[PDB]
Design a protein around this ligand. Structure first.
Ligand SMILES: *[C@@H]1[C@H](O)[C@@H](O)[C@H](OCCNC(C)=O)[C@@H](C(=O)O)[C@H]1O
Length: 433
């Protein structure tokens, strides 16, 4: 007995165009201690990335980038590791955001590392260097003293920028690689707008706010809306686009029973669209090893698997790129966590991404504004919102090496230019007209 809601696709309410390199993952720089990880020999992980997008961005940084030390002969990055990363990026078709050690390393070491990266990976595949991860939190791990402020950071950033550009005159940069805030990200954009390609921000649905639950994770985040508005103002005031270079559901590798659940797939897929509709250039979900929130879990020795969050990213992958249209929801007060995104695809077909994040309400969606004859739906499903497994998209799990294709396509009940789509509570759908 579903909530009956109306969705009006207005193909004339033009939103932002989703770039083809929108999707991405964030990893710890420490993973590069192991040259077998980001390697042309790591076909399994390479396969998982190709499935998330023919283009995308691998971001390497995180808290371990303050403890990772480049050497041409505490974790150590070797020329072998950088050489193997170039071969990895060749197998995936993805571009690279590469963190440099501004926390504990020297300008001269960062310049040397940046030179070897540009020499091996090249200007086409290297999107940006980043000078430190979350510099606003250096003072909390003692990487800097408590007195460290934006002024001190700007001094450090300039010293590193100068040293790297002497070795790498075409070196591209992004920063400041943390959450939107007025004490760091606004002044950074103002001072360094001529020295960076784009602004890099982070976002965790968990706050410092009450404890994170599946219930909480499905609701709007006023902090997210605030931070996104901040980044749009910085883009208006400076011309700098923004990318969400580190994101996931909960901090410290995630929360067992939230981050590792089917709920995370609905949250992650919806987030991708909410940020793309705000004009974000892209996203990088943080992950690695077996962390609770990792899209892809595993190791080269034991192999890799898609975790539930991966399936939300997979729905985005299958929607593909294009321009977002108006998709207005009515009669939805009793089903308020249903979200919907309409997309004019690059191939000229209309697509709708629906996230029924209501944990108790089934919906009946009356779709108008699509003058196409017919549509098919691929469902994003698990039997409970807190399932750690049993997740499918298009009636299939993702297999070894990111192997996926749909096994259940279901024609959409259509008649007189109106379509009716049923969705279970805590489910997602991709409609292709
Ligand atoms: C952003 C940080 O830059 C990340 O280092 C940090 O990840 C920590 C756990 N690592 C993994 C691979 O699971 C992340 C977080 O707190 O989860 C953010 O603080």
């Amino acid at each position: 007995s579903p909530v009956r809601v109306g969705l009006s696709v207005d193909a004339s309410a033009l939103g932002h165009t989703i770039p083809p390199d929108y999707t991405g993952l964030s990893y710890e720089q420490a993973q590069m201690a192991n040259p077998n990880y980001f390697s042309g020999a790591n076909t399994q992980l390479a396969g998982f990335l190709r499935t998330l997008g023919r283009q995308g961005v691998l971001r390497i940084g995180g808290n371990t980038s303050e403890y990772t030390f480049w050497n041409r002969h505490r974790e150590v990055i070797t020329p072998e590791a950088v050489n193997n990363l170039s071969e990895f990026l060749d197998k995936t078709g993805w571009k690279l955001i590469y963190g440099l050690n501004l926390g504990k390393g020297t300008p001269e070491n960062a310049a040397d590392e940046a030179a070897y990266v540009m020499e091996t990976i090249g200007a086409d595949r290297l999107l940006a260097f980043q000078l430190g991860n979350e510099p606003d939190l250096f003072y909390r791990n003692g990487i800097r003293p408590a007195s460290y402020d934006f002024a001190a950071y700007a001094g450090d950033w300039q010293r590193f920028f100068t040293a790297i550009r002497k070795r790498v005159p075409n070196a591209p940069f992004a920063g400041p690689d943390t959450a939107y805030n007025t004490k760091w990200l606004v002044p950074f954009a103002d001072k360094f707008k001529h020295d960076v390609k784009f602004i890099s921000s982070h976002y965790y649905a968990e706050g410092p706010d009450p404890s994170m639950t599946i219930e909480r994770l499905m609701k709007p985040n006023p902090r997210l809306l605030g931070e996104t508005a901040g980044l749009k103002q910085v883009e208006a005031d400076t011309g700098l686009p923004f990318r969400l270079t580190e994101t996931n559901s909960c901090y410290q590798g995630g929360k067992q029973g939230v981050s590792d659940t089917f709920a995370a797939a609905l949250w992650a897929g919806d987030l991708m669209y909410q940020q793309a509709a705000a004009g974000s250039t892209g996203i990088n979900f943080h992950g690695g090893g077996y962390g609770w929130y990792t899209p892809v879990a595993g190791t080269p020795e034991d192999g890799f698997i898609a975790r539930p969050e991966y399936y939300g990213m997979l729905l985005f992958a299958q929607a593909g790129a294009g321009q977002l249209l108006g998709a207005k929801l009515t009669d939805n007060s009793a089903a308020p966590l249903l979200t919907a995104y309409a997309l004019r695809g690059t191939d000229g077909r209309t697509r709708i991404a629906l996230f029924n994040k209501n944990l108790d309400a089934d919906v009946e969606v009356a779709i108008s504004g699509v003058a196409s004859p017919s549509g098919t739906v691929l469902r994003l499903e698990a039997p409970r919102a807190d399932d750690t497994t049993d997740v499918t998209f298009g009636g299939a799990p993702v297999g070894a090496s990111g192997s996926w294709s749909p096994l259940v396509q279901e024609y959409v009940p259509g008649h007189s230019g109106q379509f009716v789509l049923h969705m279970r509570k805590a489910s997602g759908a991709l409609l292709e007209f």
